[PDB]
Design a protein around this ligand. Sequence first.
Ligand SMILES: O=C(N[C@H]1COC(=O)[C@@H](NC(=O)c2cccc(O)c2O)COC(=O)[C@@H](NC(=O)c2cccc(O)c2O)COC1=O)c1cccc(O)c1O
Ligand SMILES: [Fe+3]
Length: 698
Amino acid sequence: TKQAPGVSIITAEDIAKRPPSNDLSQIIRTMPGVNLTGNSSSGQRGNNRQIDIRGMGPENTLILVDGKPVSSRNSVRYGWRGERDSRGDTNWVPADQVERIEVIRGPAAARYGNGAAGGVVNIITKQAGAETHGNLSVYSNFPQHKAEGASERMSFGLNGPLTENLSYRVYGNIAKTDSDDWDINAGHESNRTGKQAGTLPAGREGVRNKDIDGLLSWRLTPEQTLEFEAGFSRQGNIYTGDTQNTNSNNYVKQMLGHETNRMYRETYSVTHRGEWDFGSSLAYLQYEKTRNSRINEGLAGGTEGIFDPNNAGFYTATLRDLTAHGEVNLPLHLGYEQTLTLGSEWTEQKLDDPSSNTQNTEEGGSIPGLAGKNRSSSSSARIFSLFAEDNIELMPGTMLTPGLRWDHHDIVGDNWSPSLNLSHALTERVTLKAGIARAYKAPNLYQLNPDYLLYSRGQGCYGQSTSCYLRGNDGLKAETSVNKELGIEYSHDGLVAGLTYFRNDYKNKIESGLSPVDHASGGKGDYANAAIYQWENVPKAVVEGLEGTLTLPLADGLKWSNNLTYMLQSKNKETGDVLSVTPRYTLNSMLDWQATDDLSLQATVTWYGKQKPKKYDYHGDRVTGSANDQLSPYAIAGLGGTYRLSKNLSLGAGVDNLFDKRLFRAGNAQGVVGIDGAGAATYNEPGRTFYTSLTASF
Ligand SMILES: O=C(N[C@H]1COC(=O)[C@@H](NC(=O)c2cccc(O)c2O)COC(=O)[C@@H](NC(=O)c2cccc(O)c2O)COC1=O)c1cccc(O)c1O
Ligand SMILES: [Fe+3]
């Protein structure tokens, strides 16, 4: 099956029948338990949605490529409201060079440690064979409405032997997703008056991709395999007016249609793989270096996340992330039959950001212990990690899997993440699974850094109108979550029916504080002696919901598949406001007809439930008027097909959003002065879009 309780596989064949425009989030998000959301509820950078597992937000979704972490979005400034102006980290690997994607949700993911509190998405690449194989894949879409950006994608792959004991695989991708027109949301925007008259909430940012990977696999002995690979990728955007608060100035407009951020991502990796009689071994060294080059933004109030015209030009933030990992697997023949796994992990995150720590104290007054100018650019954290997995077969069909993970964070201190996963054959066709683990979240280098400083004259200050500073806090605790799940699944002859309940009890969620810890001294007029808030640990939050799957073989050539997410609860237990904004439910429905030996046909529908905005503004006061707007449930239908011309050539064609259901970003969720809120109307849903594809392969 592609769906067990807590786990989902997406295969290469699924990627081909529901082709993504560009980014994989498009297909990853259709798995049970998975949403495409912002990190908190501000709606800021709302067209920049990323993969969320069980409403735990996308910072708690760990992205791997071939078992190796991607950390590149940790190069983008983390803002007051817990969003980054980032497209996330699911668009580094081109769709057509993916072998399969593994999604692991909740208690079975806690064993991966830091930032798997929601789950793990592991994007697996196609590898060399015993002979030389390769492909050339091209995709091109055509929106009905010209405003919305079309997507074009060309990727090759090429793998094979060199000697009997030397293998290689290489691929290369070139792609572009045109931005939405600067004016797509015109006539849909929230009410904008005074200074903010004429402002617009932006459509989807465009991106240009360039990806190149080379891998050499070397098995210098029957038991011993040694892999070296390098990765070079480059994303440059196409700017279409997006700003944190949806305000505008002249620099913004100058940059419509230009590259305003470029991410270069370089990965080198050494991997040694061992199989002998005692069992199985694996250890890797990955060096990920991310350069985030983008136009300087302001760091104060309504100027937070708008191009700063007084400091025009590009800065470059540099993220050097170092990962080494060791694991063994030992089969044991004991009172109960079992398999033991022993592992260390070492990581280093160096962040050089020459822009983020430049907010000065001339207006709100100075902060004892914080220099007002020329503060360090530098942040780092090392985690050391030890873990052991025991995979115990009590009686055939039954597995009990206890694991202990211990992590030493060189600032925050010690974390203990224990876990237990039970799976039970009640019948040869029915299987019960229960799991309770405590997952782990290290504060990001922005939250942690006493040199990282935002400012507001009041409009963004919790429980007051006065000027206030928000400050990094190296005193922070790690976020932990006791992810519980109880689930049942019938599976027999491609008939699959399953339903899982999950509850994550969420401790110490890090977030902009609610009480001043202190007050600065000096500064200008009514702004002087501003209040000082830090990044605080929220004592308690809860997420809760249901994951379902149902697969029926209607006839031999014909398969009816369904995945269900239903989000029961998502609650900051301090304020009572929501954590994320998700659709109440999500049903993805595919009919797959194998019409001929050669012709396959696919109809899909996605139903999205209601979406409700946050109840409280930045003050902690109740929002009013269009800040309360909700999005009604809506559905998106699509047809496609793939006509195989030969062993060497396949063609695809179809239509996303058959009935042209469209939604428009009205702005952020709450009111500010001159910019009415837009409630849950914070993203653009594209209309009818034709697409065609071609895959040539030996
Ligand atoms: O969305 C927010 N702004 C909007 C809406 O707010 C406004 O337009 C006005 N605004 C206040 O009246 C305000 C009254 C009482 C208190 C205020 O803070 C006001 O700003 C004027 O500010 C501005 O025109 C600009 N603003 C600064 O230059 C600034 C410079 C330094 C420091 C600032 O705070 C600045 O606003 C841009 O502000 C905006 O576009 C917004 C969000 C989050 C937090 C904010 O503070 C926001 O203001
Ligand atoms: Fe302000």
